[PDB]
Symmetry: C2
Subunit: 135 residues, 2 copies
């Protein structure tokens, strides 16, 4: 049973984090914002209205929301304040979010694994795995 896009819908609470600091480092996030992001245990709320995907990132510090249509490039302002060109695709049971800015690129992959949502973030040689459970 391969995942679907609707399977990602829900309120998700962060439970585990590996390599997050090093990823935010590679992005250019200052120490201050890094220790602030790491102390947070966000909610990630995802809604899938057909191929219209909204991802709301909720914390006590900042709330960040983008809404896109699958496969249509859009302008994203990231939680760390980057202006990027982004495309979400659905590949092999995973929501793949590709960001480009300043000739740099990062990929965030969100997939369902064993009832959990696994978030993989790659920038250059820096990788990070976050694990979320369903609220």
């Amino acid at each position: 049973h391969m995942a679907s896009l609707k399977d990602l819908e829900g309120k998700w609470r962060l439970m585990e984090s590996h390599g997050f600091e090093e990823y935010m480092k590679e992005l250019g996030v200052g120490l201050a914002l890094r220790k602030m992001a790491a102390m947070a245990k966000p909610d990630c709320i995802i809604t899938c209205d057909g191929n219209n995907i909204t991802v709301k990132t909720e914390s006590t510090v900042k709330t960040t929301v983008f809404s896109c249509n699958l496969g249509e490039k859009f302008e994203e302002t990231t939680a760390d304040g980057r202006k990027t060109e982004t495309v979400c695709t659905f590949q092999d049971g995973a929501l793949v979010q590709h960001q480009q800015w300043d000739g740099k690129e990062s990929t965030i992959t969100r997939k369902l694994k064993d009832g959990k949502m696994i978030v993989e973030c790659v920038m250059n040689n820096a990788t990070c795995t976050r694990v979320y459970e369903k609220v």
Copy 2:
């Protein structure tokens, strides 16, 4: 006391509608979708995370959501399925949403009046006033 952008935040329920059919007509919405839109009494949920504005339009037929930053042009897919270039501004206590597509243009204005949210929609000679109350 002039309105603010935060004053628009909330779940809003449609209470009154004037000239809606004629507006959807001017947009090119078929009779079917028109009687379907008119029978609905949507929720409009609005959230204002600084100048990051999200407007979720909720019905039993379709849920539509866009998220933008005030003053930055973005690509919107409208509930009737138009692909438009849109800019939201804040002018004189009103959220002003300007859409362009195919050299056509429409403005949706959302303002707080006497505790109610008044939605004015203008396309060409066709105008429409919707009135929403706070849930």
